[PDB]
């Protein structure tokens, strides 16, 4: 029996502005901060603890983690910040208002761009300011592994090495893990963990700032899962 | 040539209350939060960046780091939190007001507790609430290595292994390192770095929340150091 807690970052600015975010490094709203703080308080009160946490390199997730740590009195635990946990990359949609985009390209198109397992949004041009190449966060990521766009499928491919190489061993080592990540990177990981089919994942949505608890057996096969609070 | 930036945590509740803190895990005051923020801005404006940061397991140091990372847009960097960077353990003095303590045991006595390199304050009882043993922060540290009190000499000895095993290799590795820690634990590191005598370390005081830049030669020998700011 292992427990693993997932939590999606609190409400970000672009969440609130209903803008596609992906790799753009936007921060938490005040509400996002509340949610993160409330999640940490929830975890504290339910008596949960952590020996390690995993996060992306995007401040909305890390700041959420911070608030969780702050509330749980766990600011001292090792935190692994991984670009592998990054939100799904939204290519040339990053920054665009979702309502405006669906008005322009149709809801269907947008729904494909948002939830197609295998078909990514349109890509960033390699020369877009928003491309990841010159970002210090990715300085050690081999260029050809940095996306200009992603579908969930890419996200799953990107997350898995972090799971296999780091999180799973941490869990089996008996470390109590928190993963603070993103809507679609958590969908990606959860797709893997729950062995969810390509069609079945399409409808999964994870609210901001709600601890999602996984109980895992000795082979790390999910037993059940549940949100806290 | 390398640069290493050191910063003592911003003002803490017990800094303001003039209380020996030690391993008591008190938080930053609002002033302390602002010092931490300002130090970040100052480093950001100076064009400083970091690849890795080292800190203690004490939130006053860690929150300072957070504010720095926040202001510098480096919330994603690896942070090693090590008990080895903890503030010097203050023993049975922890939580006591320094002024009343002086008023009771004498200025000399207090100053020997506070700045004598080799004489520790009086120890915590092993049964004291404040003893470290049940603390998850220290769960993997051998009991015998956990202090009930420390003089600076203990602090040095406690710090050096992190320096040798980890921070020095980072610096040699070409990593740009920030260490966010405490007055005495930095006094201890600096003693080693600058090769300050037992007598001389006595006067060294390190202000809250001010970046202290060391420029190190190839052999990690300080060439110069300066505070950033005023
Ligand atoms: O232990 C403490 O009270 C102070 C040092 O106090 P003095 O020994 O300098 O009085 O440490 P910090 O606030 O930097 O963590």
Numbering used by the authors:
A (entry chain B): 1 to 229
B (entry chain A): 1 to 230
Quoted from the paper:
PGAM converts 3-phosphoglycerate to 2-phosphoglycerate through a ping-pong mechanism in which a phosphoenzyme transfers a phosphate group from an active-site histidine to 3-phosphoglycerate to form a 2,3-bisphosphoglycerate intermediate that subsequently transfers the phosphate from the 3-position to yield the 2-phospho­glycerate product and a reconstituted phosphoenzyme. As a key enzyme in glycolysis and energy metabolism, PGAM is a potential target for novel antibiotics.
Unexpectedly, the resultant crystal structure exhibited electron density consistent with the presence of 2,3-bisphospho­glycerate in one of the monomers and 3-phosphoglycerate along with phosphorylation at His9 in the other. These observations strongly suggest that PGAM is active in the P1 crystal form and that the 2,3-bisphosphoglycerate intermediate was generated by enzymatic con­version of 3-phosphoglycerate. The two monomers in the asymmetric unit are related by noncrystallographic symmetry and thus are not identical, providing distinct chemical and structural environments for each active site. Closer inspection shows that the active-site regions are even more similar, with all ligand-contacting amino-acid side chains except Arg115 adopting nearly identical conformations.
